[PDB]
Design an enzyme around this catalytic site. Structure first.
Site, short mmCIF file in Angstrom:
data_model
loop_
_atom_site.label_atom_id
_atom_site.label_comp_id
_atom_site.label_asym_id
_atom_site.label_seq_id
_atom_site.Cartn_x
_atom_site.Cartn_y
_atom_site.Cartn_z
N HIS A 83 0.86 -1.18 0.00
CA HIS A 83 0.00 0.00 0.00
C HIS A 83 0.90 1.23 0.00
O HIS A 83 2.13 1.13 -0.12
CB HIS A 83 -1.05 -0.03 1.14
CG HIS A 83 -0.51 0.18 2.53
ND1 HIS A 83 0.04 -0.84 3.28
CD2 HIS A 83 -0.50 1.28 3.32
CE1 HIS A 83 0.38 -0.37 4.47
NE2 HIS A 83 0.07 0.92 4.52
N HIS A 85 1.71 3.75 2.04
CA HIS A 85 2.33 4.39 3.19
C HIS A 85 3.85 4.17 3.18
O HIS A 85 4.39 3.34 2.46
CB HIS A 85 1.71 3.86 4.50
CG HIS A 85 0.32 4.36 4.75
ND1 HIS A 85 -0.55 3.73 5.62
CD2 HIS A 85 -0.35 5.43 4.25
CE1 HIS A 85 -1.69 4.39 5.65
NE2 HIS A 85 -1.59 5.43 4.83
N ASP A 87 5.98 2.80 5.34
CA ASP A 87 6.57 1.49 5.66
C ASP A 87 6.48 0.52 4.48
O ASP A 87 7.02 -0.59 4.56
CB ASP A 87 5.98 0.84 6.96
CG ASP A 87 4.42 0.66 6.98
OD1 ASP A 87 3.78 1.34 6.14
OD2 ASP A 87 3.82 -0.11 7.86
N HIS A 148 -6.87 -1.70 6.10
CA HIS A 148 -5.97 -0.70 6.67
C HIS A 148 -5.87 0.53 5.78
O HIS A 148 -5.67 1.65 6.28
CB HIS A 148 -4.59 -1.34 6.89
CG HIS A 148 -3.50 -0.36 7.21
ND1 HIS A 148 -3.23 0.06 8.50
CD2 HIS A 148 -2.58 0.24 6.42
CE1 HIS A 148 -2.20 0.90 8.48
NE2 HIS A 148 -1.79 1.02 7.23
N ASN A 179 -2.60 3.01 13.48
CA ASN A 179 -2.98 4.09 12.58
C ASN A 179 -4.13 3.64 11.71
O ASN A 179 -3.97 2.75 10.87
CB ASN A 179 -1.79 4.51 11.71
CG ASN A 179 -2.23 5.33 10.52
OD1 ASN A 179 -3.00 6.27 10.68
ND2 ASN A 179 -1.78 4.96 9.32
O1 LIG Z 1 -0.63 1.55 11.39
P1 LIG Z 1 -0.21 0.24 11.82
O2 LIG Z 1 -1.24 -0.35 12.53
O3 LIG Z 1 0.05 -0.71 10.91
C1 LIG Z 1 1.33 0.39 12.86
C2 LIG Z 1 0.98 1.15 14.12
C3 LIG Z 1 0.54 2.44 14.06
C4 LIG Z 1 0.22 3.13 15.22
C5 LIG Z 1 0.41 2.50 16.43
C6 LIG Z 1 0.89 1.21 16.49
C7 LIG Z 1 1.12 0.54 17.67
C8 LIG Z 1 1.63 -0.72 17.66
C9 LIG Z 1 1.88 -1.34 16.49
N1 LIG Z 1 1.66 -0.68 15.40
C10 LIG Z 1 1.18 0.53 15.36
O1 LIG Z 2 0.09 2.71 9.12
P1 LIG Z 2 1.42 2.27 8.76
O2 LIG Z 2 1.93 1.43 9.62
O3 LIG Z 2 1.69 2.00 7.49
C1 LIG Z 2 2.72 3.58 9.21
C2 LIG Z 2 2.79 3.89 10.71
C3 LIG Z 2 3.50 3.10 11.56
C4 LIG Z 2 3.56 3.45 12.89
C5 LIG Z 2 2.91 4.57 13.37
C6 LIG Z 2 2.23 5.41 12.51
C7 LIG Z 2 1.56 6.55 12.91
C8 LIG Z 2 0.85 7.31 12.01
C9 LIG Z 2 0.89 6.89 10.68
N1 LIG Z 2 1.54 5.83 10.37
C10 LIG Z 2 2.19 5.06 11.21
ZN LIG Z 3 -0.15 1.94 6.34
ZN LIG Z 4 1.84 -0.66 9.19
#
Ligand SMILES: O=P(O)(O)Cc1cccc2cccnc12
Ligand SMILES: O=P(O)(O)Cc1cccc2cccnc12
Ligand SMILES: [Zn+2]
Ligand SMILES: [Zn+2]
Ligand SMILES: [Zn+2]
Length: 231
Positions: A83, A85, A87, A148, A179
């Site tokens: 996707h 973002h 990461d 997501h 997120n």
């Molecule tokens: O956006 P995400 O969910 O993929 C990764 C993510 C974003 C925000 C907070 C988190 C806490 C723990 C693990 N991941 C987190």
């Molecule tokens: O959603 P993810 O994981 O792709 C990117 C991601 C990872 C961890 C924390 C975040 C906080 C805000 C936005 N993105 C975050």
């Molecule tokens: Zn993402």
């Molecule tokens: Zn992520």
């Protein structure tokens, strides 16, 4: 055995062999004062490698390439971002400078451009509708529907029965949503059910962050998303 954040200094990358010819890559990134792990995939295809997702940033992704070169020694010829973002596309420019052909769906490429993120060069056709699947080298790409993010793809390796969920699938240790600013909370459980219906034989399930597991991770993510929906 599976690496965690404290094993991984920032800017460094670990590889973990899941099955024959299938590895995850694990890296870490700091954000808002906390440190997060992140997974991607590596799949052997004859004498070359298919890379799934960057290692979250230019420096991690250069280190990813050097670690693949050191431990595996086959060329990374193509990469897919699941996707839009950081990461997932952060480091696409490093991949491209190294001669890796970068790929994403047209939806991901447009969202990345609107966001000002790095843009994979090549467009993946055949993934525009929920339930669409296309073969791509040694893997099947699957668009399960918005979760997501509206564009998120998942990846299955049929030779190894490995399902990589990207950020649409949570690890079991995560009890609350992360997120969700770009998420479709209303459609996320339905999209997970498409994944379950299409890959019921999966033996290894890799979340976008944290520890792999079995197919329970799908229902786990649904539980967490539904709980978040209800505040
Ligand atoms: O956006 P995400 O969910 O993929 C990764 C993510 C974003 C925000 C907070 C988190 C806490 C723990 C693990 N991941 C987190
Ligand atoms: O959603 P993810 O994981 O792709 C990117 C991601 C990872 C961890 C924390 C975040 C906080 C805000 C936005 N993105 C975050
Ligand atoms: Zn993402
Ligand atoms: Zn992520
Ligand atoms: Zn090209």
């Amino acid at each position: 055995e599976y690496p965690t954040v404290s094993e991984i200094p920032v800017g460094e990358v670990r590889l973990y062999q899941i099955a024959d010819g299938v590895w995850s890559h694990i890296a870490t990134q700091s954000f808002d004062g906390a440190v997060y792990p992140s997974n991607g995939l590596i799949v052997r295809d004859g004498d070359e490698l298919l890379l799934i997702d960057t290692a979250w940033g230019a420096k991690n992704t250069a280190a990813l390439l050097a670690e693949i070169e050191k431990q595996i020694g086959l060329p990374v010829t193509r990469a897919v971002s699941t996707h839009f973002h950081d990461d997932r596309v952060g480091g696409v420019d490093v991949l491209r400078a190294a001669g890796v052909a970068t790929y994403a769906s047209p939806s991901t490429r447009r969202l990345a451009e609107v966001e000002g993120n790095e843009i994979p060069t090549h467009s993946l056709e055949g993934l525009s509708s929920s339930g669409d699947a296309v073969r791509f080298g040694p893997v099947e790409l699957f668009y399960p529907g918005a979760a997501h993010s509206t564009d998120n793809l998942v990846v299955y390796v049929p030779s190894a029965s490995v399902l990589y969920g990207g950020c649409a699938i949570y690890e079991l240790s995560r009890t609350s949503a992360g997120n969700v600013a770009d998420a479709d909370l209303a459609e996320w459980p339905t999209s997970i059910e498409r994944i379950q219906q299409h890959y019921p034989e999966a033996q290894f399930v890799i979340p976008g962050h944290g520890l792999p597991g079995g197919l329970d991770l799908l229902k786990h993510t649904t539980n967490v998303v539904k709980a978040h929906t209800n505040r």
